[model samples]
Target chain A: RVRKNVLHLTDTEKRDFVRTVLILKEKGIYDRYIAWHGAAGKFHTPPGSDRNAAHMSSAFLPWHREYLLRFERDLQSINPEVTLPYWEWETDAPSQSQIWSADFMGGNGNPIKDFIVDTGPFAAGRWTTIDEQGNPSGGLKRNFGATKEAPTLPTRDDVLNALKITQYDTPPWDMTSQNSFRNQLEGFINGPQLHNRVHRWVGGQMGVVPTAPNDPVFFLHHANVDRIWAVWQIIHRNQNYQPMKNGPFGQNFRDPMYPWNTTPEDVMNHRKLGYVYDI
Target chain B: KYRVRKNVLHLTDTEKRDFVRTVLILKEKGIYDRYIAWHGAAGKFHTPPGSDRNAAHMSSAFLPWHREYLLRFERDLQSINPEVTLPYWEWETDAQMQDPSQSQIWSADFMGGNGNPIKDFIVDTGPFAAGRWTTIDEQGNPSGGLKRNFGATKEAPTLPTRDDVLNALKITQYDTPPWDMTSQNSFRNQLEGFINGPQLHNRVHRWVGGQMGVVPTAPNDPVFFLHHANVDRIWAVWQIIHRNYQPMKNGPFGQNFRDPMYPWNTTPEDVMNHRKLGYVYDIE
Candidate 1:
């Protein structure tokens, strides 16, 4: 019922977590999660609209929250003691962080092999990757801090700034929404500073929208993003999700997120979904 | 009170116009994209992970899954106009023509004519022309315009013939054991066009090319519905003759008759009969 920071995980916990993930992948259950995320990304809220069910909209936080909740539930099914850990990328942004050790997530990409990740538990030939078309690609690739736009992980101050905002979201309820905490934390403000920057900084499949989940770290990254939203919820206890009844059908508080019927209102309280976070 | 689905060739000009008009309204209301999204998502949802059978296709559930999709879409069309009902493309008959692309269904007033060679094979005619009807890429982003290249692929240079339909209907079982693309003697596999590998239903998709040639982006084409309507019509005919569904007990969870289809609660058992759902083909 409690999700801890990746750094706090004991050696046994880390081993068990990675083992369960491999089992899920071998059983083909893991790809369903990847496929579900990809499916939701392509599903626009309104036809021809730029905002999708999972991203670039007011539902971004809630949608991912529901996604993480479901994923955690799946993980627990494989190993009841296991809980999805948050990477806490703000503090452990560099490749040298213990989180990237070869025994765990592995190391930086092999520069000689087109920056393909060649050293981790998910190294080339060990764990296969899938393309945007859902067909199997050869291996996982990462070019850490390769993009000029997102040179590093978001700083602690960046997360604090995002949490300080009062509203859950604002009018427009999209990427352009100003003063919207959801947009700020989503890393779409000014540039990809927070969540989006982490993706770009990680690069490779993590950099693209649809295939991001192909990387195992994608979940750990989003777990931190969800934790930030949960922290905001606690800080602004009285604030509620905006555009409750006025926004597009899929983005409203009670509306069903595409690719799944789970709604924002259904997953509003993370604790009620049966899990708490360890700071 | 059964809604009659007529062949594209049999539809009067008014019927054709109303069907197209209702589709455009559904598109404007953003209701049409849901079908496309649902189809694409279901295709990706492999049963038991890494299996060829999905919640929507390549399995016993393919026929019923599509039946429910069309039912929901037809209902949406009805909400826009009570008089409009889905029409079948009947490509088998069109195959009899010297150039199936020259069929009346491709007239400027309907699905539009064949692709233009100069405009990069974009369909610049009819209601769903490039600048008029928008399309989404495989990634679900804006892809500019609708496109078609009839008889483009060597695998399916022409449409499936009437004999193909007859042979599929002759199959005794709705689907067979190990229910998937390789399930031999399975009507679902035969009708889905994976028996001989892209022979019938799949052949039409390959023959049409462009977005229609791929599973994820196929529904972006309006004719996808028309073609599936014909496929559904063929299944309806099979149901009338065989009156059965297979692997009643040993099939995978979703493929079983009573299990809820993923992304939906509707089951194969629920959609087993066409007329029971208040719809029938013109020949019925």
Candidate 2:
């Protein structure tokens, strides 16, 4: 399988992608991914620790990689020709970009409609959302660059800086771990500069940890994050996941991440998982 | 050997102490949070997304899903102390009391008393006091202290009565079509407290307030297990009387008799008979 940039996909590919997603949605498969992501977000690594099973921890990259991989497999189950596409947010980095066009993820949230997204195939009425309680969230909403915290998407320079980091993760093995590639790429270093920035930039369901997956853009954002991690893995060929043992149970290289059994080591090699991203 | 799950009222002082001790041990070992996370996971896993039905609640799978949940929880408790089996709260009997909050289950020695209003309704007494035991927020972050405002909500000013339980037991069908909260004459829906909505199990959660008032955070309270034990026991009785699972076909994928519940491979059929799963209620 080969993952391509959203910008590179033809109109036909985009339509097929959206159709397959809608099929998955109608089949009730899409929400499972949403729930899975939400569930993992609440699964703290060491019970009371700030780091969760998926984010703000050493397993952030590997865990999301596995998540995206499984979701892609589910998508393939609907259409074998479909593979997850990366948003390449670093380059596309604008509200008016092709990724946000009506043919794709749709435009920004409408101010008059309480910031609910009123365009694209996944407009407010077309696509439904789930709240923190897993009930109907009524409709999809967005407010791009609305937050002062994340007024802009992470740039290509930001991605390069994150990629330049050598260590997979450092001791303490959490968001606080400095100069660590996992934390930097996760967008916790010097604050939300990379992966986290995009979520805040998109706002709405994408702004919060639990409901972020309610938006289809969540998967696209994570695919780009996964692509960056893949690039880092290639750069540091011999560097492996830290805390081989004695870290939190779920964050360990071999420990099974909560809400699923797949471990960090199990998903270490992107190619081994049978996919490569085209730069 | 068959373990009998007795009523909370019947548990001796020693049994109660041991049960509390075992739970504390599990919490210390970080094993307790697993159950909390699992409950939260199932709550969000809608059977057919956008519908009220989920892998765990407001659906036909509610009873069996919780049966499996309690079974796993009991096994973990047993691992800590082989002599300990889960105990049912028997809230309906407690509901007979003029003040249900006065029940021994809320005693400081056991599940703890009501939360303190002066301290933002955080539980300040017993084994799970604010400082003694920890609680997690909706985001899974440590949210200091278990809070309980008993009968605080208008929706549930009191617990369900025995008459309510007996009335629900009269329902013949396991669950009807739509197989969700809207299902009429559904033994599953009624017992789950969604018939008149929040009548039985749901009422108890709302009455308890704090984490118990919500589905995702209810398991944070150790009493959550005891309360569900009573719900399961009630289902066991219904099964003996009604005698069959329903909508074996045409129900949502996970709600079907043979469909494997989400987040697990265990089918509703696998957990249909609690006795075959290797334990019986004290009443049985």
Candidate 3:
């Protein structure tokens, strides 16, 4: 579990961890899937209920944490050296980011044309993926800084202020823990604290709910999100995470991730899980 | 000067006796109704159905209102024992609710044990199970008992560990605008367990269950003091970090609290600062 920044990967390594993502599309993982389809109905809870375990709760951190780990493990099974690479969107806007070159990830989506990827390694007519309709077919899609609301990406101060938060989470530890480090990082709390913005900034297929994994950049985006966890932990090691002595059924830290027996606490400590970021 | 409320579990046998003895003394004094009535399901000064009432503040006023209420109780306790300050429960720390029979705080000597099957929902064992429950309860009788299921029933997947207390401290504002039940980013609502996400205070009442679980007569149970003390400590920790974050506009009555409370006639402005009120938690 050696995840490195996308900007740091060599051409060969990109062909491995960064390159192997497409093969996953051709032959997906068995009986397991990762996507943001809302928590209760889409991922964890029963249908007809708005239970989103991922977007606004204490399990948000660990659920996503486990999702990436399992995804990485699956990719590694295809190619042992393959590890997730972070896109580092905080460093530059997606339109101008270096990872968009044909060598790394593909470039932005085409305008007025179904938001298809017309450039980079994942151009239209080449890559196929799961679309919003639950039907299968599409290339990678990303329109960097395309929205009027997101004129540019979050500034350095945005990330810096998120770092200003010293606590991991608090009571009613969900999407609205106000000044909590987890909710903010999930992008549920907005601005310097959002995973929401990055998704919005990319737009198109990357912006669509549930099927975001179709875009290789989603992994890279999440790898950075994962890396942010490491960053916060390094600075505030003592206040690293909230205690989970009980659960709201599926909301507990140690609750089974479903389809897999690994509990949240089992994967909580990254180093203890045999991994570290190349920050 | 206001005295510090230390952890009840940390109190010596004599100190705890003084605490319980005063509770019994206050029970007989008939003044206890004023305190518990505000918290139980019925209104202390509430009118008959369909009438507007100045009830015990639960929505956003929970933080400041309870702070004021506890201060009043402490003042009355002093009349019984000059040195008796209420002790906190610190459930997030030493007394986290893992199981009903787990902590020293829940031992027969402390908050009492689970309700026996024969008494049904009422507690059968422990110091509080006897006739002392009549001070405040859903039923106005001596036959009733204090009750709990502990970890046995109504189990929560999580509780606020010390890690959570530390997170609550980082919040910058005391109470945000639109500060009633729907208030967001307000430390006041979070403590009252009304923030958009899961909060700590309300869960304690749920885990306490039965009488403690119900709103009208929760104070009839003796454990209410220790539980509220822990709730009060949450506020103490919140205030210490956001010391500069003052309560801004918006409230249930459509205005902020410069207006008087029902029994106390004191404004939230009066009870907002724990230091000004002459008390602090031992940890803070």
iRMS, model 2 (angstroms):
2.3
User: Across residues A170-215, which tens digit of lDDT does each residue of candidate 3 receive?
Assistant: 6566555677888788766754235778877888766765667667
Kindly indicate the candidate among 2 and 3 with the higher lDDT: 2
TM-score of each: 0.81, 0.82, 0.47
Model 2, residue B72: distance off in Å is 3.6
Best by TM-score: 2
Question: Where in model 3 is the C-alpha error above 4 Å?
Answer: A30-41, A44-51, A191-193, A243-247, A258-260, B1-284
- Candidate 2 global lDDT: 0.87
lDDT of 1 by residue, B91-166 (tens): 9999999988999999988899888989988999999998888887765677867889999988999899999988
Candidate 1 C-alpha error for residue B178, in Å: 8.3
Q: Using DockQ as the measure, which candidate wins? A: 2
Residue A147 miss distance in model 2 (angstroms): 5.7
Tens-digit lDDT track for model 2 on B1-284? 29889999888888899999999997877778878888877877777766677798888889989999999889889988988999999999999999988999999888899988999999998989988888776657777778899999899999999999999999988889888888898888888886787799999999999999888888989999999999989999988887667669888877889877777768888888888877889999
Sorting all predicted structures by DockQ, with the top scorer first, yields 2, 1, 3
Best by lDDT: 2
Where's the lowest-lDDT run of ten residues in candidate 2 chain B? Answer: B136-145
Query: What TM-score would you give candidate 1 relative to the actual structure?
Result: 0.81
The true-versus-predicted C-alpha distance at residue B225 of model 1, in Å, is: 1.1
